[PDB]
Design a protein around this ligand. Structure first.
Ligand code: ANC
Ligand code: ANC
Lengths: 155, 158
């Protein structure tokens, strides 16, 4: 029985959107800028940043977007995306993230959003079991597809 | 022989995702292949001894949502019809992962063995409650909350 040492950087990896609520429904409706499907998050303790990778449909077309947020002394984060954003992590653990975001768009309109995100955790022992079974069946490693990275890098 | 196994898999039902799929015949999982399956949901029924698979596959340049029902055998394996006949076994299973072995025989008698690793997206009640309270605190109407786990309009992996 063992578990990796808890580190903020250990939280980095594939994350998925569960729910997003908005004070302004138009922001999360079809073609809304905040109807975001998360792919990956990267936390950097040293730099005090969080890199967001997500997908959003715009003009009937899916787009991959990257946003870097920077931490402030008070602990909140600021990011530039469809206006200015100040977001706050309300709850965070190895498997979930609950956040509150305040957005002020290019017209001075303020929208507040809430979101619940979950992390996809792949444990070492499970990967080992998969590879052993795969080698037992005489399957060459080049004949294995990584579906998770495909989902993390869509088009 | 061996003795019966107490089967309580019902609680493992929910959203699941494909991590890796291996195959003895690469054609079956290459792009446009029948087993290049992106899982979405699994539902286990301990009373009927079945498992419902819900996944997406791209065929001839078009995305398809597929539903397959598998039935458990006395042997402990499950059988299901999909692009031929399939007999699969759960080699390792927990609240977070599933490692399985599947044997498929297509319409031409060709045998293909596949291995797979799937992961569950677990949403805890404690975290859901935190989200709902926060959402209520900010005066957001339940109608103004979008569910991204079970949504029709989603990005394409390829
Ligand atoms: N700061 C941000 C930048 C880009 C997208 C965001 C999407 C969010 C969704 C729910 C809650 C907070 C969010 C913050 C975001
Ligand atoms: N029963 C099934 C139906 C449809 C696709 C499957 C893809 C699989 C991939 C690896 C291991 C087992 C699998 C079973 C499958």
């Amino acid at each position: 029985e063992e578990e990796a040492e808890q580190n903020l950087s250990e939280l980095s990896g594939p994350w998925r959107t569960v729910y997003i609520g908005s004070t302004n429904p138009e922001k999360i409706q079809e073609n809304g800028p905040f109807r975001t499907y998360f792919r990956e998050l990267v936390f950097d303790d040293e730099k005090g940043t969080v890199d967001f990778y997500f997908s959003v449909k715009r003009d009937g077309k899916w787009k991959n977007v990257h946003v870097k947020a920077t931490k402030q002394d008070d602990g909140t984060y600021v990011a530039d995306y469809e206006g200015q954003n100040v977001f706050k992590i309300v709850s965070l653990s190895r498997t979930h993230l609950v956040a509150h975001n305040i957005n002020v768009d290019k017209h001075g309109q303020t929208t507040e959003l809430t979101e619940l995100f979950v992390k996809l955790n792949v444990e070492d022992e499970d990967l080992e079991k998969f590879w052993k079974l795969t080698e037992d069946k005489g399957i060459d490693k080049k004949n294995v597809v990584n579906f998770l990275e495909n989902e993390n890098h869509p088009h």
